[PDB]
Amino acid sequence: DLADLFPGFGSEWINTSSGRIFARVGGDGPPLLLLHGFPQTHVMWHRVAPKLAERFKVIVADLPGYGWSDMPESDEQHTPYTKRAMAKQLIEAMEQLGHVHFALAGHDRGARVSYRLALDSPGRLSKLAVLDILPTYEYWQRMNRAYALKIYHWSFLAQPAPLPENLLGGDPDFYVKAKLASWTRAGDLSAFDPRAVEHYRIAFADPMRRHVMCEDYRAGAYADFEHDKIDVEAGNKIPVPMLALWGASGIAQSAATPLDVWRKWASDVQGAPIESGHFLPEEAPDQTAEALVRFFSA
Amino acid sequence: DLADLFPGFGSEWINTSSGRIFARVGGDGPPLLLLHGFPQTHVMWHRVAPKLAERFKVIVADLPGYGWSDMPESDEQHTPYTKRAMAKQLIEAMEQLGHVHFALAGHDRGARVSYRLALDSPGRLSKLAVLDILPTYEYWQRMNRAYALKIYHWSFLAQPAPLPENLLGGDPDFYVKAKLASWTRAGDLSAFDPRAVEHYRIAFADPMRRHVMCEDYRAGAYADFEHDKIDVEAGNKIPVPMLALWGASGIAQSAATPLDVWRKWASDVQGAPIESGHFLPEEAPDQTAEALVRFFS
Ligand SMILES: [Cl-]
Ligand SMILES: [Cl-]
């Protein structure tokens, strides 16, 4: 079956009004919520989370609809898979554990939940880290020929159902491995623990999990963009101290210099590149863990 | 099996140095070459070609690599599927028939061959008509969120092999029907003759034909864009009289006001909207045929 990649961590199914959140929980200390993105699950943190668990109570959650979390039924506006809704559902989940103020690090889609959480509900966060993203608004505003070729999946996966779902279902293994490999520094699967790849492949093998991922990308092209547009045009900035980490060969640094962009969105932001492709916690786990431990311990 | 949608047209395999071009030929009078696009074949003209063959020798060709035309081997720059190379191949095809000066109408990819041909070899054309396109340069320069979502296949099908080939193989019958339906005004397949859909569906079922289509879109993102950019930067304009027709619900009108764009590209252009989605000759065959005969005659 599927390997346990978090030796010593407990497992929790947290009930919320939108379905259960699955999480691994370990460590002790101030609470720290870790959110994955696409096409992964909470196991992508397995190389970094033990180092964090030395200092923090580490909650490694599957996003709503991902991994082993429940999949709320979507609707015409992709509501449960908007980052606004995911953020609210994770706030509820954390409250079930007694965590009403916590630290948060997210990667990829999870990072988008994270900065939206900080915009909507900043009082819930002590500190925020985002890994290898710019805000959704900024990717769309910078969508020229070169970038449309680089992140074509932003507009492919956002096509109306069931178009991407039907194409993905012919050979799901190929696509999940293709995306994992294409966004790494090396362009192959060598950075990943094969036991982790199996987790990602098995999640992607479920047609309803694939649909959820497309709903996430549809939200990303519509409501998420519109929520971000409101904030940027209103000049609303994230007031929580934040860390922006990005991969020197990752996605965010394509088509913008990341710290300059985040300075427009956040009043107190620091950042650093890491020699890595998109998948910082797996491609560069020691470097990522150190940056996060330093930031959240300050 | 496949219906003959061009009663009284002959069927020719035209040899060129890059492979054979399939065409239906009918009519008499001045020569007029009609070029289809994606994901179709020459049969998309079946409702309009008979009206044109009243006045013209109508040659209804499958693009290089499409339909029953041969598929030249591609290379790392997608050369045979660049519009420049497709245009040269079709010029050679027409010379085989003794046509060195001819009228030309194209739709979708075939219209991209056509305006590239008009830029490269304008002495070959008496008149040019392009259906529901803007130049490739213009699509890419207008790339924004709205357009990226609308013409997502421009960046999806240009991804390196074998990504789009493998995904298209996931459900090819669904994909080709989805493209046909989604770009019509009706949003379904009711605008199409079912026998024509069978033609499109059967060509799309061949993986090698699907690969060529991706090669076409790869050329469309790279060399075709570069070739257009040179002409824009040099201020080169199409000197052939041209007609730009577009669908009121079609693709070209999403990016811009099509006649204002074409006036930047052509010194003598007229144009009009047709009450139609993208597939003008099938969604609106009478309006399309009328406009073509009036312009070409
Ligand atoms: Cl992302
Ligand atoms: Cl086109």
What distinguishing features does this structure have?
homodimer, 298 residues, alpha/beta, eight-stranded mixed beta sheet, 14 helices, 43% helix, globular, binds chloride ion
Provide a descriptive summary of the structure in words.
The structure is a homodimer. Chain A is α/β, with parallel strands linked by helices and 298 residues long. Chain A has one domain (1-298). The first copy, chain A, contains 14 helices and 8 strands. Chain A has helices spanning 49-53, 83-96, 109-120, 136-141, 145-150, 153-156, 163-168, 172-182, 194-204, 207-221, 223-234, 258-265, 280-283, 285-297, and strands at residues 10-14, 21-27, 31-35, 57-61, 102-107, 125-131, 242-247, 269-274. Chain A has an 8-stranded mixed beta sheet with strand order 1-2-4-3-5-6-7-8, sandwiched between helices. In chain A, strand 3, helix 1 and strand 4 form a beta-alpha-beta unit. In chain A, helix 2 (83-96) packs across helix 3 (109-120) and helix 8 (172-182) crosses helix 9 (194-204). The longest helix of chain A is centred in the C-terminal third of the chain and has 15 residues, at 207-221. The first copy, chain A, is globular, with a radius of gyration of 17 Å. Chain A starts with 9 loop residues before the first strand and ends with a helix. The interface between A and B is medium-sized, with 25 and 25 residues. The structure holds chloride ion (2 copies). The site of one chloride ion has 5 residues of chain B, from helix 3. It is classed as hydrolase. Keywords: dehalogenase, serial femtosecond crystallography, hydrolase. It forms a dimeric assembly.
